[PDB]
Amino acid sequence: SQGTKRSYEQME
Amino acid sequence: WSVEDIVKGINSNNLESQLQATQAARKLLSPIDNIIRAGLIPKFVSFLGKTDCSPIQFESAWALTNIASGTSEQTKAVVDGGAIPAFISLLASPHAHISEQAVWALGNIAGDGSAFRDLVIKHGAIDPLLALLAVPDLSTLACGYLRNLTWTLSNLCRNKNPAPPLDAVEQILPTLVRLLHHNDPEVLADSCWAISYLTDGPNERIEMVVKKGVVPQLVKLLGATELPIVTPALRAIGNIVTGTDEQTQKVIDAGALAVFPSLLTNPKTNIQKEATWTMSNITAGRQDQIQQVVNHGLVPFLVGVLSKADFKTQKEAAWAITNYTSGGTVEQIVYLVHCGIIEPLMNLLSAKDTKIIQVILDAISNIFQAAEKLGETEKLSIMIEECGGLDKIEALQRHENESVYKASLNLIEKYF
């Protein structure tokens, strides 16, 4: 497996 | 002068009467809807084409600029009056001060929304704008002029729904890269903001930017002292590492990780949060990329952030940890535990935020899977208990969220 990329809008 | 006096002077066939009147309309605006009601905006726009009279050109651009800085109805009045193609024509004016007025004006218009932005683009503003910046020495340009040109370009890059046309971004990008090598803080800031806008989208938008070779200069700007420079630089870097592993790799190879000990400990909350966000996406990468986080000695810094930061920054730290444990090796996870990750992780299990609970439980689950391959599950269990973790995990069995009570139930039955 591998970690989850989160875009800027996904952070906020 | 009152409105009627100006209307008479502007509508006369005497050029100097027209000039005097436009000067008066400038100072009044310096009663917008009464000016518009008299239909003076199309007069101002036509005066922009009087090449043989730069004074009335200047006065008109000024008047049109004031009205455009008002409400949406007034800005569209200026636009539907035809200010956009008129201003674009003045970009190549032999009068530099007139060209500058046109730049600033086109900048405000384009910065209103995607519609007006694309209108400025579709009337062909980009080529003459870039031509102005194609000089061998940027210092030949007025500092205010250069700043306005940069700010205008960033507005042409700004906004989604829809994002700017691909060909437009393609034409603008190399100029933005060169502006990143400037020394003026404001020029650097706007250029970085422009980059942050372009990297705020699908991987294809990221790839365009990264392929231009912009990353090494971004990383350098990341180390600047000026906060108005660091903030968009960090945003741009952050957006890039949301992409593919290889796009993220180019950030790493540029030496970005060396700046993060200062970023993660920066007194400004926003900088800390977005640096931690950035780290979370890097630990979401491959094992060799996670190892780079380790080698730069960033793990104790992440542990520090998870322990002693504001809650929303703590949440970003919890994401970094879980992403670490998802892709990391058993060896990388062991080192993580030795940096004292367990207690601050447990402390946040009592947070009222459902998302961070799910995220932390996933981290715990991943760490147990590593302990299993070590034959050290009991010791991990005892460690989690001794820092108040067991009490919190059990309380989470009566949680309202399905993912939470399932995971915590699983952990209890399985290891406790």
Numbering used by the authors:
A (entry chain B): 3 to 14
B (entry chain A): 76 to 105, 111 to 496
Task: Provide the publication's sentences verbatim.
To elucidate the structural basis for how NP ncNLS binds to importin-α to ultimately develop novel therapeutic strategies, we determined a 2.3 Å resolution crystal structure of the NLS-binding ARM-repeat domain of mouse importin-α1 in complex with NP ncNLS by molecular replacement. Electron density corresponding to NP residues 3–14 was unambiguously identified at the minor NLS-binding site, in agreement with previous observations that NP does not compete with SV40 NLS26 and binds to the C-terminal ARM repeats of importin-α33. The structure showed that the NP ncNLS binds to the minor NLS-binding site through a network of interactions in a manner analogous to that reported for some of the minor-site specific NLSs such as the NLS of RNA helicase II/Guα23. The N-terminal region (residues 3–8) of the NP ncNLS adopts an extended conformation and occupies the P-3′-P2′ positions, whereas the C-terminal region (residues 9–14) forms an α-helical turn and packs against the P4′ position at the minor NLS-binding site. The main chain of the N-terminal region of ncNLS is oriented and anchored on importin-α through multiple hydrogen bonds with the exposed asparagine/tryptophan ladder along the NLS-binding groove. The basic NP residues K7 and R8 occupy the core P1′ and P2′ positions. K7 forms hydrogen bonds with V321, T328, and N361. R8 forms a salt bridge with E396 and also makes a cation-π interaction with the indole ring of W399. Juxtaposed to Y10, the hydrophobic side chain of NP residue M13 makes an intimate contact with the nonpolar patch on the indole ring of W357. Thus a small subset of NP ncNLS residues, namely K7, R8, and M13, make key contributions in nuclear import.
Importin-α binds directly to the NLS and then recruits importin-β via importin-α′s importin-β-binding (IBB) domain1314 to form a ternary complex that can dock at and move through nuclear pore complexes. The NLS-binding domain of importin-α is an elongated superhelical domain built from 10 tandem ARM repeats. The monopartite cNLSs bind to the major NLS-binding site located on ARM repeats 2–4, whereas the bipartite cNLSs bind to both this major site and the minor NLS-binding site located on ARM repeats 6–8. The NP protein encodes an NLS at its amino terminus that has been shown to function as the major signal necessary for the nuclear import of vRNPs242526.
